[PDB]
From a paper:
α-Amylases (EC 3.2.1.1) cleave α-1,4-glycosidic bonds of carbohydrates and oligosaccharides; Hence, these amylolytic enzymes are employed for industrial starch liquefaction and saccharification. GH13 family enzymes have three structural domains: (i) domain A, which forms an N-terminal (β/α)8 fold (TIM barrel) that functions as the catalytic domain; (ii) domain B, which is essential for substrate binding; and (iii) domain C, which forms a β-sandwich designated as a putative saccharide binding site6. Here, we present the first α-amylase structure from Anoxybacillus in the unaffiliated GH13 subfamily. The overall structure resembles previously solved structures of GH13 α-amylases13 and consists of three domains: catalytic domain A containing the active site within its TIM barrel fold (residues 26–139, 187–393), domain B (residues 140–186), and domain C with an all-β fold (residues 394–475).
TASKA-M was obtained through co-crystallization of TASKA and maltose, while TASKA-T represents TASKA in a post-maltotriose hydrolysis stage. We hypothesize that TASKA-M mimics the enzyme-product complex, while TASKA-T is a snapshot structure of the enzyme after maltotriose hydrolysis (post-substrate-hydrolysis stage). In the absence of a substrate or product, the structure of TASKA-Apo reveals that the active site of the enzyme is occupied by water and solvent molecules, whereas the structures of TASKA-M and TASKA-T show maltose bound to substrate-interacting subsites −1 and −2 of the substrate binding site with each subsite able to interact with one glucose subunit of maltose. In both the TASKA-M and TASKA-T structures, the maltose coordinates the βC-βD, βE-η3, βF-η6, βI-α11, and η8-α13 loops near the entry site of the TIM barrel and forms hydrogen bonds with the side chains of the Asp-Glu-Asp catalytic triad residues (D213, E242, and D310) and W101, Y143, R211, H309, and R362. The subsite −1 ring forms a π-π interaction with the side chain of conserved Y100, which is common to the GH13 family. Comparison of the Ca2+ ion binding sites of all three TASKA structures reveals that the side-chain of residue E110, which interacts with Ca3, underwent a conformational change in the TASKA-M structure relative to TASKA-Apo and TASKA-T. Two water molecules exclusively found in TASKA-M interact directly with Ca3 and bridge it with E52 and E110. Notably, E52 is not involved directly or indirectly in Ca3 binding in TASKA-Apo and TASKA-T, whereas a conformational change flips the main-chain peptide of Y51 to allow the side chain of E52 to interact with Ca3 in TASKA-M. The cause of this conformational change remains unclear. Structural comparisons also reveal that the carboxylic group of E110, which directly interacts with Ca3 in TASKA-Apo and TASKA-T, adopts different side-chain rotamers and interacts with a Ca3-binding water molecule in the TASKA-M structure.
Numbering used by the authors: 26 to 477
Write the structure that this text describes.
Amino acid sequence: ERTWQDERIYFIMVDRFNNGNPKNDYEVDVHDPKAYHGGDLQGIIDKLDYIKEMGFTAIWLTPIFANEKGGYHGYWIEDFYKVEEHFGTLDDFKRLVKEAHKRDMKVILDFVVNHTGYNHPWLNDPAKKDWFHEKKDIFNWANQQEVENGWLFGLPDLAQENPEVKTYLFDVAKWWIQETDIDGYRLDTVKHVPKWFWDEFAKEVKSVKQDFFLLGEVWHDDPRYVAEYGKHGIDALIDFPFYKEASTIFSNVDQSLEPLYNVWKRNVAFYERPYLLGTFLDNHDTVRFTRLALQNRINPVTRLKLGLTYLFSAPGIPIMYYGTEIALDGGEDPDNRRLMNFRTDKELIDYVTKLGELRAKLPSLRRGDFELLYEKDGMALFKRTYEKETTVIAINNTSKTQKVTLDGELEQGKELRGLLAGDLVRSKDGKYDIILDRETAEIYVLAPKTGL
Ligand SMILES: OC[C@H]1O[C@H](O[C@H]2[C@H](O)[C@@H](O)[C@@H](O)O[C@@H]2CO)[C@H](O)[C@@H](O)[C@@H]1O
Ligand SMILES: [Ca+2]
Ligand SMILES: [Ca+2]
Ligand SMILES: [Ca+2]
Ligand SMILES: [Ca+2]
């Protein structure tokens, strides 16, 4: 049976992905980094086979609801019940969904309950005076009240305490599910909205579709803070603690992988569903992983191979930001949202393809436990077991050839067959000598000894 633990998510910012219809390019200026660039829903449909062939099983779209002027990213909503006209029509969205489901892919929409756009009509409506919290900045971030009540970046902060507001938000959450048959929501700005609302919200959306999937964006690096939202009806959480370590570690050579293993232990300790954590190297709110490599004056492709191998072999739900597969450069927002280029070399596309194939094929990578066998200054060995399958993941994030001998940590008398790069390690006198050249990786399955 397919569960969310088994999924791999491709993450698309609609306006910056693929312009499949030039006729809806109304305010487009591709030479203005703050304008619409013209990517749309037709462009997504056009690339569903591309996405599926890399092995992704689900797409998360940035919000598609009608935005005010300048809202190319979707987060400045003007009408919760309408598709943004740059992106297409409702009919186009239903067809995207249908086309995704025909290829056995799930669709998650980015969903906003915390705020409206700066210029939403409700702000000039006296009958909606009490739909918004008092207009003030958040200054004390350690006061969770203030975090929940204040206007984030000056965004009008909806007052969920008002039952009219709460009801409008529940109804529109249900409406999209009923109308379009989407598979889940990625919930924006979760920590800015009180926990009691999340419990009710989850009950409401699952009343329409019992298996509806919620993925919460809780922007924080302390997994104790993040984990609490798991207890209020949100199935899965975005793993910022993972990202903080993975982005750093993999964007330069000779750096220890051990912090990632501590992320995992802490995940098991704090979260009720520690495999339902969204893993990533970068996203729409971060400097591009490629750019971190470039800052380090080091080849981004080799960095990406190492980081992606970890992402696709460690616990959680990998989430790959569009463009990762082409080492798309970019600095801080908005430069980390460049239009996708489909006319590049295929080296990383093919690599991702193999990683997604292996994670599909090896249940230990989706469901196994996760042990650390060895880690030294960037040379790492991990082991994963599920029922009768044992895999070993070897990542040499060092600048030299490394030989690491296991002696006891695996059952004697077998061989490790390298499924990513064809390596072969045979038990010799009960020991396995794993040799990796600098900056390479391998994923082995343990299996019986073969021979000529
Ligand atoms: O105008 C503020 C800001 O809004 C958006 O930031 C998003 C961010 O992208 C999301 O992942 C999430 O945390 O919520 C924020 C607002 O809903 C835009 O993406 C950003 O460019 C813009 O500056
Ligand atoms: Ca367009
Ligand atoms: Ca608009
Ligand atoms: Ca709020
Ligand atoms: Ca060590």
